[PDB]
């Protein structure tokens, strides 16, 4: 039948949410499943009326086919994108056809000039 998985778009690896900095600026922290794969997560934000932001944990025992944990986050405050960010190892985070739009604003260019 239909399916809700193709609303949803990986963001580029190398930056991920930090989720304490973006809860703290208005952020919430509103699912947390243990399931071990990536798109297993993606399928709970989905469920989850007010989940924008779906964060995953890599390298259970498969590397790529499979993920440790997954954490949802809403990542707005006011209508506002107030979600933040840094570098990482071991994370990836996929988002919403309505706030992708917005992370890739954030990735495409950058602050300094080396």
């Known amino acids: ?19 304490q900095a973006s ?3 208005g952020a919430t922290f509103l699912e947390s499943p243990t399931v071990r794969r ?10 989850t009326q007010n989940c924008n932001l779906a964060l995953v944990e890599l390298q ?10 997954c954490f949802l986050i809403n990542c707005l405050y006011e209508q506002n994108f107030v979600c933040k ?16 739009r ?8 950058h602050h300094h000039h080396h």
């Open 38 to 47: 990536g798109w297993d997560c993606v399928r709970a934000c989905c469920t």
């Open 85 to 100: 960010f840094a570098p990482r190892e071991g994370f990836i985070n996929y988002l919403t056809r309505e706030v992708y």
């Open 60 to 69: 259970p025992d498969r590397g790529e086919d499979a993920i440790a944990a």
């Open 102 to 109: 917005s992370y890739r604003q954030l990735v495409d260019h």
């Open 23 to 25: 809860v703290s600026n």
């Open 1 to 19: 039948g239909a399916d809700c998985l193709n609303s949803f778009t990986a963001g580029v690896p190398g930056f991920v949410l930090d989720t």
